[PDB]
Ligand binder design. Structure first.
Ligand code: SF4
Lengths: 49, 232, 147
């Protein structure tokens, strides 16, 4: 036994979706405060990042 | 042990037995129907059998295959009912093929029926001696224009059920509406597709984050906001 | 384990919060969910403390980041010595400018070093926030302690 009023109810939207756009995916952001220092110790130049 | 009274057990020792009578009660209140009382046979007056004051009407009913066991599969006895004049089909077309109801089988001895079933009148009547079983209808394996066969099952039988009912979700709720976890009791605000309605007959949650935000119960959301656990 | 049989600590700063599953329980509070960062670079001076106003609906916690231009001190010979800088951060509580938190830095560095300190915004409604420098401004060019 099959009814005919099924394609109407089947062509119904899902639970909205609630945006869920790409925007950003898991990719980490840029590291902040990239300070680099120049020092003179033991008569030698050193740099620290 | 069984809840068998002393008198019926004592009677069930002698050689000259009485007549065994089986009566059936189909209860559909839990599903949306009524209580039907059936007996395979009628009294000597051509009248429905009177037991405990109530009446069981005659109708061809036959139960076969009652096998209680602890191992192997469960018990699935078969109940056969005559479908004449379309009487069974009438409720089957209405009560979703008699699925989910309860059946109660009571067996009694002849010498304990009500006095109105005998022309002389039984002086040994005792409307408290019977053996009772209950089962649930599982499916209507075959209902033709002359008969109808139902499969029975134990209420506590497990089949197709899993133990850890909890399921971890991302953006969908897991429980019902207003039942125990959605402690919402205010006016209707949303509907199936998250539309701003204020009518109570159409208030059903969409099982989303937006529904919770609409109903201000996001603190009671069952969907953990992980999502991105497998991408990284 | 983090504690042994005797009881003395075994690991460094570890914070653990446990909640048994029970209805209408309080949510966890140690960790954040969403943060809005606003950048407005300005230098705090001893004579003119810096004031800002906070006006938002959803307030749970507020984090202040503050920086130091340089801290190394050089004498006539040329030897490098660290110095001390102290700042006080205050907010509005029942109309009183009582000091909310302090900060003190002691370490030789000539780099623009920025640190962060968080606080729990218990007072509701838009309010005001300030910081004040306690170390007096350097007169010479030898001390570069600028915050
Ligand atoms: S989603 Fe939020 S509102 Fe809809 S049922 Fe689950 S908990 Fe109750």
């Amino acid at each position: 036994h099959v009814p005919e009023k099924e394609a109407i109810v089947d062509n119904g939207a899902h639970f909205d979706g609630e945006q869920s756009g790409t925007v950003n995916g898991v990719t980490p952001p840029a590291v902040q405060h990239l300070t680099a220092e120049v020092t003179a110790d033991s008569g030698e130049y050193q740099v620290l990042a | 042990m069984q809840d068998i009274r002393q008198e019926t057990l004592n009677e069930c020792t002698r050689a000259e037995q009485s007549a065994s009578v089986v009566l059936w009660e189909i209860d559909l209140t839990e599903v949306g129907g009524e209580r039907y009382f059936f007996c395979n046979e009628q009294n000597e007056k051509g009248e429905p059998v009177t037991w405990q004051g109530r009446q069981y009407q005659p109708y061809p009913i036959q139960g076969s295959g009652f096998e209680l066991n602890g191992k192997g599969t469960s018990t699935r006895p078969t109940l056969t009912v005559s479908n004449l004049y379309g009487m069974v089909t009438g409720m089957a077309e209405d009560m979703q093929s008699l699925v989910g109801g309860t059946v109660v089988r009571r067996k009694v001895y002849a010498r304990f029926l009500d006095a109105v079933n005998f022309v002389n009148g039984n002086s040994y009547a005792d409307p408290e001696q019977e053996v009772i079983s209950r089962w649930r209808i599982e499916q209507c394996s075959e209902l033709s224009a002359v008969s109808a066969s139902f499969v029975l099952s134990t209420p506590t039988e497990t089949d197709g059920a899993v133990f850890p009912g909890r399921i971890m979700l991302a953006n969908t709720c897991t429980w019902t509406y207003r039942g125990d976890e959605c402690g919402y009791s205010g006016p209707a605000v949303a509907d199936e597709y998250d539309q701003p309605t204020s009518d109570i007959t159409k208030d059903k949650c969409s099982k989303c984050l937006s529904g919770c935000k609409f109903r201000n119960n996001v603190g009671n959301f069952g969907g953990f906001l992980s999502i991105n656990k497998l991408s990284q | 384990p983090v504690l042994d049989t005797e009881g003395n600590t075994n690991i460094s700063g570890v914070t653990v919060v446990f909640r048994a599953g029970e209805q209408e329980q309080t949510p966890p509070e140690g960790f954040e969910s969403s943060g809005s960062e606003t950048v407005l670079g300005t230098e705090v001076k001893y004579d003119t403390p810096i004031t800002r106003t906070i006006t938002s609906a959803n307030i749970d916690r507020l984090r202040f980041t503050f920086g130091v231009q340089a801290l190394v001190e050089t004498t006539s010979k040329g030897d490098r010595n660290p110095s001390e800088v102290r700042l006080l951060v205050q907010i509005q509580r029942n109309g009183g400018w009582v000091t909310e938190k302090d900060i003190t830095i002691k370490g030789k560095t000539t780099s623009q070093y920025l640190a962060s300190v968080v606080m729990g915004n218990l007072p509701p409604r838009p309010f005001n926030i300030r910081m004040r420098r306690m170390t007096p401004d350097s007169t010479t060019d030898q001390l570069q302690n600028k915050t």
